[PDB]
């Protein structure tokens, strides 16, 4: 007993806003659907909003302080401004000056709260309608790597400066520095597993999208009714991939492949990043001891010099 | 309406002769038949020839001419850059060239065979487009950039852990590679593709075996994001994002060695535009 | 000694074997399920 109209057109805190839905024409022409709204604004949704905007306010005001409260310099330098965690002289301490690490600490705490409350929102809104809870656990798998990056790897290493700064360029710098610090990240085996799964996810997404659009003349994209009886579009897709590869799938288990290929990426990445500093302080030397590095005795270096 | 069909009838219903590319060019397809489950046609023979010869040449260059049985310690490397665009059977890098040409033939044959099988089943040409994107990525990495730079020694070596050394050295020669705009666009599209795949898989799995209508997932995706895309729209977005991710990253690697030498000096113009130059004080200048 | 360290087997080779074997077995079972007899629309009437 679920009334979808009540679920989408209710008032109050446990209800929706933007009640008269909008409509965008180019989305209707390209994507096939153009209605915008209404959006649910219940509890677990106000908390995420408020904590996310608290952290964002802190970050942007600190940007302004660094620039000097000059709007033109603010606009010029916006993409290389950041707030950085307290330096290595401090350990995991919180008694750090506001312009040397306190702002990062406050903003990151609020960000943690907001992402947890968003997970709760996904879970409860999935249960409120008639569907199962598979997006919540995918978000949990994604959040494992987030909490490794921002909370647990610095905790095991012993300093807050092992975590990224809050900025457009700061994430690229963190990636570069973390790879440089612990040997070479190409010789991290769980980085190899992560890249395997990421590239497989992109390949599988492209394949599924292309083969469903190619057979869409026979309404193959209505995957809800195709899991009860399969018509000409699904039969043609199965035959195509059988005559190409020698094996095929269903309109059901292909999305199982999708879920697990996208899930394994974050788990393997989290394991690799956590092991990166705490057990193997140098990945090229480890790969040398593990017999996976090629000799290369006489390089032709004229390629790498201008 | 619907009944139990054993899938032998569905395979035998759709098998037709002669609707391929070679059947339209020559009037007949010489190899138009099926071996086991696979469809052999023209471009199905060229591809298999290329595959066999490429594997043989790769393994001969690895096991012999290097003397190693360790598969993760081979360096199948091109000629040096002092040889130019010349090929010599008596010089190192000859089995790399043979393997590269055979692999090119195999990949193009696979693409054309996909076009054939699409034509037999009266489908659209989306799968050949999506695969041709990454085939063109291989072509620009191994053909266009080496020719423009001026030597076959500008291609990457085909070793399993050693092609990652070429990636590292090329990325640090044009430092900083993170500051490449097309690199950033490609990374953004890769991350978005993985996110969209997870979202679609979750969404379809969450409604599978349930006594619910087909409008529940629209309400779910409208309560959380304010907007639900649709059923053909998500698969279109998947296709387009997947292709564009590599289409944009072709340009970054091509322009790294030809028109640009430094991706930190690329952004030197930004602070010199008249709208905001000369407005700061010491250490806030420029 | 010509042998890798124990971490070489723990972190590199066992996961690779697991990945390859899992791919083979998952492919076998998904193709087994896909090509069985269940409710389909008759190709003659549908087309």
């Amino acid at each position: 007993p679920i009334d979808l109209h009540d679920e989408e057109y209710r008032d109050g805190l446990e209800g929706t806003i933007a009640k008269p839905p909008g409509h965008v024409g180019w989305m209707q022409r390209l994507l096939g659907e153009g209605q915008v709204g209404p959006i649910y604004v219940g509890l677990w949704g106000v908390i995420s909003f408020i904590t996310f905007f608290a952290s964002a306010f802190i970050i942007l005001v600190d940007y302004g302080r660094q620039v000097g409260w000059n709007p033109i310099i603010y606009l010029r330098e916006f993409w290389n401004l950041a707030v950085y965690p307290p330096p290595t002289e401090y350990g995991l301490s919180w008694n750090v000056p506001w312009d040397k690490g306190g702002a990062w600490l406050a903003a990151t705490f609020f960000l943690h709260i907001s992402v947890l409350t968003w997970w709760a929102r996904l879970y409860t809104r999935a249960k409120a309608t008639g569907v199962g809870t598979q997006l919540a656990w995918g978000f949990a798998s994604a959040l494992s790597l987030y909490f490794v990056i921002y909370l647990f790897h610095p905790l095991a290493l012993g300093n807050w400066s092992a975590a990224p700064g809050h900025g457009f360029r700061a994430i690229l710098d963190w990636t570069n520095y973390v790879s440089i610090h612990w040997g070479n990240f190409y010789y991290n085996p769980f980085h190899m597993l992560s890249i395997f799964f990421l590239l497989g996810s992109t390949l599988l997404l492209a394949m599924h999208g292309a083969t469903i659009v190619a057979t869409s003349k026979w309404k193959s994209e209505m995957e809800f009714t195709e899991m009860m009886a399969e018509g000409p579009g699904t039969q043609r897709a199965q035959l195509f991939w059988r005559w190409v590869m020698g094996w095929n799938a269903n309109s059901y288990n292909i999305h199982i492949w999708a879920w697990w290929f996208a899930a394994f990426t974050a788990i393997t990445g989290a394991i690799g990043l956590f092991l990166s500093g705490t057990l193997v302080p140098d990945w090229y030397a480890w790969g040398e001891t593990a017999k996976i590095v090629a000799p290369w005795p006489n390089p032709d270096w004229a390629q790498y010099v201008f | 309406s619907a009944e139990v069909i054993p899938f032998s009838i569905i395979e035998e219903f759709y098998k037709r002769p002669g609707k391929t590319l070679a059947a339209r060019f020559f009037g007949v397809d010489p190899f138009d038949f099926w071996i086991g489950r696979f469809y052999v046609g023209l471009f199905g023979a060229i591809s298999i020839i290329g595959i066999i010869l490429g594997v043989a040449f790769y393994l001969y260059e690895g096991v012999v001419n290097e003397g190693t049985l360790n598969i993760l310690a081979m360096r199948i490397e091109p000629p040096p850059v002092s040889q130019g665009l010349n090929v010599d059977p008596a010089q190192p890098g000859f089995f790399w060239f043979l393997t590269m040409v055979a692999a090119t033939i195999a990949f193009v044959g696979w693409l054309l065979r996909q076009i054939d099988i699409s034509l037999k089943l009266d489908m659209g040409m989306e799968v050949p487009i999506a695969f041709g994107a990454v085939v063109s990525s291989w072509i620009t990495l191994q053909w266009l950039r080496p020719i423009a730079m001026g030597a076959w020694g500008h291609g990457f070596p085909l070793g399993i852990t050693h092609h990652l050394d070429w990636v590292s050295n090329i990325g640090y020669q044009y430092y900083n590679f993170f500051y490449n705009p097309f690199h950033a666009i490609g990374i953004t599209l890769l991350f978005a593709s993985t996110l969209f795949l997870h979202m679609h898989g979750s969404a379809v799995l969450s409604e599978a075996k349930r006594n619910i209508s087909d409008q529940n997932i629209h309400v779910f995706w409208r309560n959380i994001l304010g907007y639900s895309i649709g059923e053909i729209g998500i698969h279109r977005v998947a296709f387009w994002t997947g292709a564009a991710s590599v289409l944009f990253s072709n340009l970054c690697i091509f322009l790294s060695g030809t028109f640009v030498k430094d991706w930190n000096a690329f952004w030197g113009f930004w602070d010199k535009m008249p709208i905001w130059n000369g407005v700061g004080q010491g250490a806030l200048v420029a | 000694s010509p042998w890798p360290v124990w971490s070489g087997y723990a972190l590199c080779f066992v996961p690779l074997a697991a990945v390859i074997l899992g791919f083979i077995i998952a492919a076998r079972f998904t193709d087994k399920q896909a090509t069985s007899a269940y409710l389909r629309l008759d190709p003659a009437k549908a087309n």
């Binding site: 195709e226 899991m227 009860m228 009886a229 399969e230 269903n250 309109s251 059901y252 | 139990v4 599978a208 075996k209 | 399920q33 069985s36 007899a37 269940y38 409710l39």
Partner: peptide
């Protein structure tokens, strides 16, 4: 009875 999703609904 046998359904594409592995179910056997009456």
């Amino acid at each position: 009875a046998a359904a594409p999703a592995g179910a056997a609904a009456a």
